[PDB]
Design a protein around this ligand. Sequence first.
Ligand SMILES: *[C@@H]1O[C@H](CO)[C@@H](O[C@@H]2O[C@H](CO)[C@@H](O)[C@H](O)[C@H]2NC(C)=O)[C@H](O)[C@H]1NC(C)=O
Ligand SMILES: *[C@@H]1O[C@H](CO)[C@@H](O[C@@H]2O[C@H](CO)[C@@H](O)[C@H](O)[C@H]2NC(C)=O)[C@H](O)[C@H]1NC(C)=O
Ligand SMILES: *[C@@H]1O[C@H](CO)[C@@H](O)[C@H](O)[C@H]1NC(C)=O
Ligand SMILES: *[C@@H]1O[C@H](CO)[C@@H](O)[C@H](O)[C@H]1NC(C)=O
Ligand SMILES: *[C@@H]1O[C@H](CO)[C@@H](O)[C@H](O)[C@H]1NC(C)=O
Ligand SMILES: *[C@@H]1O[C@H](CO)[C@@H](O)[C@H](O)[C@H]1NC(C)=O
Ligand SMILES: *[C@@H]1O[C@H](CO)[C@@H](O)[C@H](O)[C@H]1NC(C)=O
Ligand SMILES: *[C@@H]1O[C@H](CO)[C@@H](O)[C@H](O)[C@H]1NC(C)=O
Lengths: 219, 48, 132, 127, 48
Amino acid sequence: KTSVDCTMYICGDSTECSNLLLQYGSFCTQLKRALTGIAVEQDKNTQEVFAQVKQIYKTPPIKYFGGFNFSQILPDPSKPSKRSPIEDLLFNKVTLACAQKFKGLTVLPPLLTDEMIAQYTSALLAGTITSGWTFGAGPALQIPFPMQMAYRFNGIGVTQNVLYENQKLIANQFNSAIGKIQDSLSSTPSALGKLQDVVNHNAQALNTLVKQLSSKFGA
Amino acid sequence: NQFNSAIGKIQDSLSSTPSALGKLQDVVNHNAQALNTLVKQLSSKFGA
Amino acid sequence: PCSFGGVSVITPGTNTSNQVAVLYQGVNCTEVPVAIHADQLTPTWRVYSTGSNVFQTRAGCLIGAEYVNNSYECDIPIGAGICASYQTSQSIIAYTMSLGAENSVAYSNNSIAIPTNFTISVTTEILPVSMT
Amino acid sequence: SANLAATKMSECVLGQSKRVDFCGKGYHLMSFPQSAPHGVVFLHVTYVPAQEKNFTTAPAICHDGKAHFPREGVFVSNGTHWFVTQRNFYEPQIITTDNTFVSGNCDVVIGIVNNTVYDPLQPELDS
Amino acid sequence: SANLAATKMSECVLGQSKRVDFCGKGYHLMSFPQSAPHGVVFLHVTYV
Ligand SMILES: *[C@@H]1O[C@H](CO)[C@@H](O[C@@H]2O[C@H](CO)[C@@H](O)[C@H](O)[C@H]2NC(C)=O)[C@H](O)[C@H]1NC(C)=O
Ligand SMILES: *[C@@H]1O[C@H](CO)[C@@H](O[C@@H]2O[C@H](CO)[C@@H](O)[C@H](O)[C@H]2NC(C)=O)[C@H](O)[C@H]1NC(C)=O
Ligand SMILES: *[C@@H]1O[C@H](CO)[C@@H](O)[C@H](O)[C@H]1NC(C)=O
Ligand SMILES: *[C@@H]1O[C@H](CO)[C@@H](O)[C@H](O)[C@H]1NC(C)=O
Ligand SMILES: *[C@@H]1O[C@H](CO)[C@@H](O)[C@H](O)[C@H]1NC(C)=O
Ligand SMILES: *[C@@H]1O[C@H](CO)[C@@H](O)[C@H](O)[C@H]1NC(C)=O
Ligand SMILES: *[C@@H]1O[C@H](CO)[C@@H](O)[C@H](O)[C@H]1NC(C)=O
Ligand SMILES: *[C@@H]1O[C@H](CO)[C@@H](O)[C@H](O)[C@H]1NC(C)=O
């Protein structure tokens, strides 16, 4: 999100220039309104994705789920913030990129902080582990995790004795895949270019706008 | 019975004063302001 | 530069009252009377820039509303998890949002919960289709 | 928005959808369109469960060295006997052969229990 | 992109999806959101 100042940008602290600028009219108020609309829309965009359940559920204290291991994805309380290990790698990889220019240009802060967003994803994870799809349609109804997995196996068209007869093998495969995700993400060729390009585009656009001030336009 | 009662409440809740139809009022308002500003711009000397 | 240009004003609505609050983006409480040059400003502007209701936020310095402890849903955003609202004699308060109600459901090895009744509900959806 | 509203009309109104929360909040039953200035309003009719109770449950049921699995339900007990009910509404029923299917014996499944599965034909075959 | 992410949260995470290739590559079983700067990361558990 960003914001602009008509006068401080166009007329640099020059009161005669500021007086003369009044002739042109409503141009920069138009620009201000457009930018304000964008800024509000950003916070709405963040709200829609994550704020899907009112009720904030909590992680169970006992961590036995029939052999399925989720410690990689669940929040880790020891480290000061409740960020899961994978969220830690993500927040260390993306953030290679509130500036010295301030020629009338600021960068406003987001409305929801990262602690709040982490709380929301934790609520969804806890609800999903304990109850199945039920918590997004009504009140949460607990169910054992292997029975939930059998339900899903029926969903995709394989009978449910198969899960109960290969429970251990299935759990091992799932744990191994979760383990490998960390390394696949730690692979140097950045798969996070999608989120790096946003910061790159914004920084470069601001630099171009600022550098434009040292031009004469044929004067 | 549940169906009928729900429909009655729907009508009342829409009838509530708070703006529930802002998504449709904005389409009107935006055009009004656009034209108003466009007319206002005629009174600018533009350096003359 | 000479002076910081614009501020942000929080109003409950001229319908309701005439109190406000002012937000000084990007500055810090102790030097707010400076960099606004509060001395040359008229009175009724010097009432802000100092006082007993002075708050520091990640977004800036907020003067004119006090900080309660309990939480409510957002009414007027200010930034960084801080909202504000007009509420009980009558004044403007500023708090932290509440993300939602608190809950915790019981997971056990061999327990299952099953509904025994149903309700039918009707909801609405408003969408635009065209413009002038 | 126009494209979204056309999709919602095709799927919500002229059919019953299984996309979650696309067509209302809950389990979808039907929809009804109305007309507004520059717009449209849908009225969604859904299903929402209520008034749940806890029970205790098991994966399968061992009987004669055979394991019965439910066909379209979940085994539950009220502390004394074991029934099988459908899944979104509580209707206990007697466990019979028509209700379940059999696969393997009782040493592989974890959490299996002991009970009897009544056979409809034998009481008819008194002699 | 944000509207897409909301749809994936509703279909992929709070339910089990029957659309092909929407939620991963395989047959979909479940998914787990994880937060990241200026976006979100999904983990799609499937069958092969
Ligand atoms: C779930 O997986 C984690 C990650 O492998 C397990 O944590 C490991 O525990 C063993 C035994 O203490 C250690 O040798 C590893 O170094 C641990 N890994 C890490 C990254 O610390 C965890 O034990 C598993 N869950 C259970 C219940 O065993
Ligand atoms: C399911 O809920 C409905 C209400 O939604 C219950 O119906 C009520 O029953 C009581 C007792 O007979 C009546 O006094 C109410 O007038 C009923 N409400 C309506 C709207 O008709 C129903 O009893 C519940 N199901 C069960 C098994 O108790
Ligand atoms: C202020 O608002 C109230 C209710 O919103 C209304 O009754 C009153 O008429 C408004 N004031 C004026 C001057 O219209
Ligand atoms: C505000 O300024 C004072 C002194 O100039 C300083 O001690 C304080 O840390 C500043 N505020 C913040 C949030 O750093
Ligand atoms: C479920 O069983 C496991 C292992 O048998 C045990 O660790 C756990 O405490 C049990 N949970 C309950 C609620 O009995
Ligand atoms: C029944 O379920 C409720 C969930 O609200 C729980 O608090 C209670 O302990 C359960 N009782 C049992 C499992 O006996
Ligand atoms: C369980 O259900 C059976 C069959 O309806 C009944 O005979 C028995 O009394 C019930 N047990 C309890 C504890 O209610
Ligand atoms: C179930 O019945 C068999 C019959 O031989 C017995 O061996 C087994 O111990 C029983 N299991 C339980 C949990 O009662």
